[PDB]
Amino acid sequence: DIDWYTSWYGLGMKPFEAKVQKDLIEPLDPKDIEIKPDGLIYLPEIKYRRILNKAFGAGGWGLVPRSQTIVTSKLVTREYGLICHGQLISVARGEQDYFNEAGIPTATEGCKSNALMRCCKDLGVGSELWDPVFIKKFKVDHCTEKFKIWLRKDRQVE
Amino acid sequence: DIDWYTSWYGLGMKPFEAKVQKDLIEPLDPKDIEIKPDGLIYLPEIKYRRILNKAFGAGGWGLVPRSQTIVTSKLVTREYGLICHGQLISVARGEQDYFNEAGIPTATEGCKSNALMRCCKDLGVGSELWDPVFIKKFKVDHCTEKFKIWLRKDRQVE
Amino acid sequence: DIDWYTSWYGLGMKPFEAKVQKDLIEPLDPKDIEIKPDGLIYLPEIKYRRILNKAFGAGGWGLVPRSQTIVTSKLVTREYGLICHGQLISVARGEQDYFNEAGIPTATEGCKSNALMRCCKDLGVGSELWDPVFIKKFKVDHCTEKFKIWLRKDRQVE
Amino acid sequence: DIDWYTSWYGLGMKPFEAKVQKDLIEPLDPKDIEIKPDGLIYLPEIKYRRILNKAFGAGGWGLVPRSQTIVTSKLVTREYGLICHGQLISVARGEQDYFNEAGIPTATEGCKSNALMRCCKDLGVGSELWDPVFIKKFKVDHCTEKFKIWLRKDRQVE
Amino acid sequence: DIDWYTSWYGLGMKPFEAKVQKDLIEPLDPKDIEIKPDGLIYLPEIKYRRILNKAFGAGGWGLVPRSQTIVTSKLVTREYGLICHGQLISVARGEQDYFNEAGIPTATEGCKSNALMRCCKDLGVGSELWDPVFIKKFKVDHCTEKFKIWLRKDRQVE
Amino acid sequence: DIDWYTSWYGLGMKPFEAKVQKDLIEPLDPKDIEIKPDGLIYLPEIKYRRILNKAFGAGGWGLVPRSQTIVTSKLVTREYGLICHGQLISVARGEQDYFNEAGIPTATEGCKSNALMRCCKDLGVGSELWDPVFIKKFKVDHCTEKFKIWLRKDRQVE
Fold first, then answer.
1. DSSP 3-state assignment of C144?
2. Which residue of C has its CA nearest to B7?
């Protein structure tokens, strides 16, 4: 049994079976990838959990908080660590903006999922989201600009 | 079990199998290598994780923080150590600039990845990025200058 | 297990196998050797790591810090010790200049690598860099002067 | 395991095998021997390490510091002890001059190597450097004077 | 294991094998013996180490300090003890003059070697240097006077 | 193991083998015996060590100090004890005059050897130096007076 709020068990101590690693590094479908109005591309946070459930399984992974939450005058932030298949994988800080005091609690879920994608970096899940070769190819094959902001070829203005 | 926030276990105590070391010292594809406007060449931080996942595996490596974060009036810095295949490899300080207070938390990921590439030095991963013979050959074969700043032969001004 | 921040384990207690020692004392390629504008010759810091990875292996060596960092009004300095193949080899102080306060953290990597080459002295790696017979032959065979500063025969002014 | 900062283990307790001792007392090549402008002859500090690596091996010897460094208004000094083949051989104080405060850290390597040659006295390595019969023969066979300072027969003024 | 800074182990407890004692009492070559301008004859300090290395071996002997150094307004002095072949042989005070404060550290080596020759008395090494029969014969066979100071028959004024 | 600074081990507990005792009581050669200008005869201090090395051996004997040194306004004095062949033989005070403060350290060797001859009394070494029958015969057979001071028949004025 492990105190996952402070422990580091299993970190780096062995890799998963080849089947798991294959499922972790499998390429993304370009249909799943989004883009902000100012052009930053991203993968929605439920897609990471779908890949995690595919690779390890439900109940085969989980986040733990690793700190107190800090509430600044504009932002909510906290560290979370990612357990997978019985060993710690990563730790990352997460963030979320909030615009009035009633949002301070709701931002916590944004914070948690924001930490999740960061902890997914160290698994290689969706690695091509971070690769400039992929980013600037994607912005040509699958996106466009309108009056000035960015959109996909199958989305509309809001 | 190891307290990776303070331990030094496995450091230097034996090298990996020849297959792992071969995958660590394998040459870079020049298409993966970027260049700043003032001419400094670099390899994007996800490429290091791809090589780490190739050599050791997902879950076969990981960073731990090794200090408190320090937040200066312009910069966020922290030490991180790199565990690989059940033994400590390296420790390095990382950095990231920030330009208004809402960026102090986001800089932490830059900090972490900035420490990662430094910890990758001691593995030989992408060693030719540091070699002047390679640097000044690369600036001729694959890069150019325009009005005055530097670019690749397959990039454009921003 | 060893507290490499304070221990002295293995120091001088036996030499490596002949194969390792041969790879440590093998001569340098004169193409790898650089020269400062005021004439001081040197070998770039990644070349030492390439020889270390060749002789011992990746994960078969590593630096540990051996002190607090000291930050003077012009310089960053720290002691580091060099572990190789399961035994301590050397300890050395390292240095790096810095010219404004935002550089204090970045200088740490210069400091570390500056300590690394010093710790490499006690292995014989690149020993001919220190030999006056070699230095003044090299300055004739492979270097030249221009208006007054020093350069290689295959380099240019900056 | 030994605390080499304070221990005296192995000192005088047995001599090395005849092969090692032969390699320690082997004569110097007069080409390796230098001379100061005011006439004092010396052997450059990397040559001692070459003989040490030849006799014992890389990793078969090493210096430890044996005191705090003292920084006078003109000089940096520290004691170092020399471990060889699993036993302490010698302890000596080392020195190095420094001329502005930014040199205080760099002098440490001079200090260390200055202690190394002193610790090499007690091995007989390069013993003829200390022998007046050899010194005044060498100053005739291999050196000369010019307007007034001393030089070798294959060196020039600086 | 022995704390040679305070111990007295082996002192007087048995003599060496006859071969060692023969090598210790073997006569000096008169070519090795020097003379001061005011007539005092001596044997240079490296010659004692050559005889010690011949009799015991490299690593078969060694000095330890036996006190703090004392720094008077003109002189540096310290006790040293001489270990040989696994047993203490002798303890002696050593001396060296110094003429400005920058010499205080350098005098330590003179101090150490000055103690060494004194510790060599109790071995019989070079015993004829102390014998008046030998001294006044040597001053006739091998030395001379000039305008008034003393010299060897194969030396010159300085 | 014995704390020879305070112990009394072996004192009087058995005599040496007959061979050793014979070598201790063997007569002096009158050529070895000196005489002061005011007529006091003596045997130089290296001769005692030669007889000690002959009887016991090198490493078969040794002095230990037995007190702090006392420095009067004219004299340096200290007790020393004489170990031989694994047992304490004697303890004696030694003396030496000094005439300016820079001589206080050098007098220590005179002190030590002055104690040595006193410790040699209790062995019978050179016993005839103390015998009036021998003294006044020696002053006739081997010495003479000149204008008024004493000399040997094969010495000269200084």
1. strand
2. C3
